[PDB]
RNA sequence: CGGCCGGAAAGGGGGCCGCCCUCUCGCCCGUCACGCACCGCACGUUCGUGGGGAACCUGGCGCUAAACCAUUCGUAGACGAC
RNA sequence: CCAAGCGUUGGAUUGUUCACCCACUAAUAGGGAACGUGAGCUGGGUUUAGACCGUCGUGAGACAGGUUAGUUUUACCCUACU
RNA sequence: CCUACUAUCCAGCGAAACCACAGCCAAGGGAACGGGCUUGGCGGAAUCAGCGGGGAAAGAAGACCCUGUUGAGCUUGACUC
RNA sequence: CCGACUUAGAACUGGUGCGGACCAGGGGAAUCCGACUGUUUAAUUAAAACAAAGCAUCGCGAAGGCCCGCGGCGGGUGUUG
RNA sequence: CCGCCGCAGGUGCAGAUCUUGGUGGUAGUAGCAAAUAUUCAAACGAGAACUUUGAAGGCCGAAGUGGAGAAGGGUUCCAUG
RNA sequence: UGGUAAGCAGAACUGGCGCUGCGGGAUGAACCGAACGCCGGGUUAAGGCGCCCGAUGCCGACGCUCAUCAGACCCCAGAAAA
RNA sequence: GUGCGAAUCGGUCGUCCGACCUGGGUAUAGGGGCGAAAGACUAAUCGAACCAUCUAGUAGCUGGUUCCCUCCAAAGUUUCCC
RNA sequence: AAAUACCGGCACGAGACCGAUAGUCAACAAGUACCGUAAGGGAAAGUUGAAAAGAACUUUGAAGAGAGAGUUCAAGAGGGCG
């Protein structure tokens, strides 16, 4: 007979294939729709998650409850040094769908780029791109160089451009850079190519790209979790105790006589590490660089206008199981998707924005960069030793 | 005795044989395959590696439930283990051979296992006890392994 | 024969000119004699320098790589995998 | 009328399905899948063996009467699914 | 969420129940509930950890019910002692 | 001169912790059943079932009452009244 | 050891949850998880996670994992290989 | 004949299945055609002849019908009043 | 729960000077024993132990019933029967 | 007394019988081993070769085991071996 009290179900079945996804990078699965009426512009970035930390502001919306009061929002520091451009590649509007034309690279490439095309690099000879190289220091190679544009402009509809991460500047371990297809947005074919070229073998920041209280779209990989059980994985109602070979599971798996097991019955395996791509994470600022300028090296990124002190981002003991944030960085609201040193793919929105929460203009009055390595008291190494005087140390 | 295969001249070839010894026949069937088309110095360097789980032997026909290995894929396979007694027990063998080969006068570094073999000896009982006053068997599975070599390059 | 101009939806072997190039034949009526005329007989005649592979020659022109194991990592992990 | 996309609840008494009442709510609609679903649980109810009461039987015993206590086994195979 | 012992991976050792053939589904007809048949869906080596929908899974010639001119324990106002 | 174990009280003290581990009763108002202790279906029922002391009838003065035995100048209660 | 003519039968197997023996798949699978705990060196040796000696760390904690018997066992006692 | 009716229970007559394949009904113990030693040629029955799938690939005849649930072959496999 | 075990293990529990617990010796024997009574116990066997013989007990009831070819080929109905 | 009976016992002779899952339970260290407290229950198990001529000696290994020699018609008969 029929279900006696109804339920909602356990999970959604859009994210179905609950496996681990065969990509540590997030591919951007749909790079947004353009218009030659724009001027041309990057669609997409590479960033690496370091940490999370409050933000203290003054709300702007009226009627609400919160208007011309002070808030305590979770921010989430995703560093971003600037990237590298190595190559431009070409696609056609086909009718089995959008096909690869003609892919032309530029001499120079860094060996940190060089690294993505290698498994060994250590057992290798580096003759990667030795004979590709060749074409830009020849008159008959040039020929081709030349009417492989000539033919991108004619024929090829879709121009996105290979950018590729300095790892060289990151505090992880690896140096390995990452190397991403982003899409050039804007105007006409031939003004956009003629665009790609001239940004060819240089290096592209995060103002260029991403601006100030835009909605962005983080694409990453979740943080894996191993082999769980059902109510660890679909979160189902545990059993009661009294329960013979097992309670942490579901009691019954389909009916007799469909006589299968169903797709949407709740099983046990892989959860977390799965490719994911949470929208409308609102950008509060875009720091600086650790510039050098008279000798004096400064680092007050997180110098808000109603504080005037030179602490950087950078908390007291840098962020934890990440290291020590010293490049140009973006700042989103709330939680972004996986692990600390996560590569981050930021995309552009695919929608419209003409909201008030979508339009709303940010105003940081505080940063916290409190330790995060226990229950912080002291923002900065001289509030410290102001407060604590001085130890035996000294 | 009567081997399996004649060597193909009975010059070149010495022969090694070993009847009831007490290993594991599945277990010896599958390092037997994996030593078949080796150069006699490259199966010694071998099954010196599956005694110190350096390299693996892939379990192809008897491979019910054999976990799976990274070591497996020199092999284009999924499963693999270091069998230790079986390693011993045709490397003894080998060591007899090129004994054989020494006696019978041949150049001993260009010696290529031709045809090996492992038959099924006759099964040895004893007993396990089991719920409600039940005896069960738990007889052992030997084996007989002869082998051919033969000089070449 | 070397260049002169095209081809992208699954680019396709073609058009045209000079010259480097050699005849005056080729097509159609009519004369002139010939070729195993294999002695009644079956798989005839093609696209075929087909496709796929082991190898042996004789010439040149060219190129000297990566994957896997092993080690390490811990954004990953039952084992593999990553 | 088109219309099954998403919902359709928390409790007192009863082994109950069903019933009835309290409260909440947009609404507290009805059903099927071997009267879904025991190598999934549970064992309150029924439905072995121990006993008590009432009615019937001379008796052994009977009750579509009430009551209390009463062992819930196995997956390592094929497929399905993860 | 944590701990111990397993499960898990390895060296060595190494059983058992069970098994016509075997093993992907929808509908049809059929001994009125098909793994095999008919018409359609369709169909890609070899495998590891799990799981309990299905094999009307295993176990034991139904302990219920009926029949048998088969019984046994008990009873009595049954028949014969 | 020689003492071996207690008990009561006070001052001070510790980050209010002190039967610091271990050992080690949850309580109350009632209803049904059986007085209580004891016993029971070894391997699914420990109970309200059996027993029980107390109560109450019945038989028999021995050649007898109750019971055993194939048998008997046979036997148990009975070394009894 | 067989052909032909007669003669005689314990005369022909796929099945009987048939009898006896033998072998498969499952399967190198389930498993080898009750009671805190092992470690460094040396010796003998062809060979040591397990023997033996030392050193350390531990457990039984006198209602013991300690020393002696009764019943039962029958040479399991002891040395050497 | 009894029953609201039943792939229900009980009769008469003849024919079938059981004991029996073969061609058709996609499929099927009973329907329709027709009963069988081992084969070649011919031709039929009952059914067919867009493709599956042998055969209408006829310059077939005459009408009827449009369905946002068309319709489409004994037994027979889903319908009425209006 | 193919166990440590053809009844065991863990915690928690009943009783613990008495109708207490227990070793040996000894008495009761199968329609018999013994039973503070559950048809309980009587050597893993009890609403009648175990062993051998009667015995190959009987079964209108299950299950099986062993070579080939040719020829003929049914019945499930009448009457009587614990 | 005689004529009659005799699956025990001592001794013989025979068979249209059986030929090691057969024939006695027993072709062998069989009423043996083993099981049961006991009464009782009760198996499996034949064959190297004509003759041991049963493989000296060399060689690998800790050894089981091999490799060569050697005996024999034959080890394609190597000690549980037609």
């Not at chain 1, 502001?57 to 560093?79: L, M, Y």
């Not at chain 1, 001239?198 to 962005?216: A, H, K, T």
């Not at chain 1, 299968?260 to 977390?272: E, H, I, L």
């Not at chain 1, 900065?380 to 102001?386: Q, R």
Request: hydrophobic content about 30%; proline content about 4%; overall charge positive.
């Amino acid at each position: 007979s029929h279900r006696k009290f109804s339920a909602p179900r356990h999970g959604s079945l859009g994210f179905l294939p609950r496996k681990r996804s065969s990509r540590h990078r997030g591919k951007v699965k749909s790079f947004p729709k353009d218009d030659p009426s724009k001027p041309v512009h990057l669609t997409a970035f590479l960033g690496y998650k370091a940490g999370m930390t409050h933000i203290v502001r003054e709300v702007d919306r009226p009627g609400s409850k919160v208007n011309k009061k002070e808030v305590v929002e979770a921010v989430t520091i995703v560093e971003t040094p600037p990237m590298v451009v190595v190559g431009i590649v070409g696609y056609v509007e086909t009718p089995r769908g959008l096909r690869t034309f003609k892919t032309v690279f530029a001499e120079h490439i860094s060996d940190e780029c060089k690294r993505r095309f290698y498994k060994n690099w250590h057992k290798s000879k580096k003759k990667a791109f030795t004979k590709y190289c060749k074409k830009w220091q020849d008159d008959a190679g040039k020929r081709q160089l030349d009417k492989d544009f000539s033919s991108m402009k004619k024929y090829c509809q879709v121009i996105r451009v290979l950018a590729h991460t300095q790892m060289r500047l990151l505090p992880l371990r690896q140096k390995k850079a990452h190397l991403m297809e982003i899409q050039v947005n804007g105007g006409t074919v031939a003004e956009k190519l003629d665009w790609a070229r001239e940004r060819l073998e240089q290096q592209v920041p995060v103002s260029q790209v991403f601006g100030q209280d835009e909605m962005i779209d983080v694409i990453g990989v979740t943080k894996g979790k191993g082999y769980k059980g059902v109510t660890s994985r679909w979160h189902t109602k545990k059993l009661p105790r009294k329960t013979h070979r097992g309670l942490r599971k579901v009691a019954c798996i389909g009916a007799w006589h469909p006589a299968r097991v169903a797709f949407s019955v709740a099983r046990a395996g892989q959860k977390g590490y799965h490719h994911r791509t949470e929208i409308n994470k609102k950008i509060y600022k875009i720091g600086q660089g650790y510039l050098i300028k008279d000798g004096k090296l400064i680092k007050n990124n997180a110098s808000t206008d109603y504080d005037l002190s030179d602490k950087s981002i950078n908390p007291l003991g840098g962020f934890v199981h990440y290291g020590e944030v010293t490049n140009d960085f973006v700042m989103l609201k709330g939680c972004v998707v996986g692990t600390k040193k996560r590569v981050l793919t930021l995309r552009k929105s695919l929608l419209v924005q003409t909201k008030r929460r979508a339009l709303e203009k940010i105003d940081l009055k505080f940063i916290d960069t409190t330790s995060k390595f226990g229950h912080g008291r002291f923002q900065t190494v001289e509030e410290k030793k102001a407060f604590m005087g001085p130890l035996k140390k000294d | 005795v009567r081997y399996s295969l004649d060597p193909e001249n009975p010059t070149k070839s010495c022969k090694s044989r070993g009847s009831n010894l007490r290993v594991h026949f599945k277990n010896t069937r599958e390092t037997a395959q994996a030593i078949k088309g080796m150069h006699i110095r490259k199966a010694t360097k071998y099954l010196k590696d599956v005694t110190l789980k350096k390299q693996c032997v892939p379990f192809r026909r008897y491979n019910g439930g054999v976990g799976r290995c990274a070591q497996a894929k020199q092999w284009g396979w999924t499963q693999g283990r270091w069998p230790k007694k079986s390693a011993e027990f045709l490397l003894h063998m080998l060591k007899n051979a090129e004994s054989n080969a020494e006696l019978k006068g041949l150049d001993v570094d260009s010696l290529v296992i031709e045809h090996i073999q492992v038959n099924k000896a006759p099964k040895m009982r004893r007993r396990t006890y089991r719920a409600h006053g039940r005896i069960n068997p738990y007889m052992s599975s030997p084996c007989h392994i002869e082998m051919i070599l033969t000089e070449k390059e």
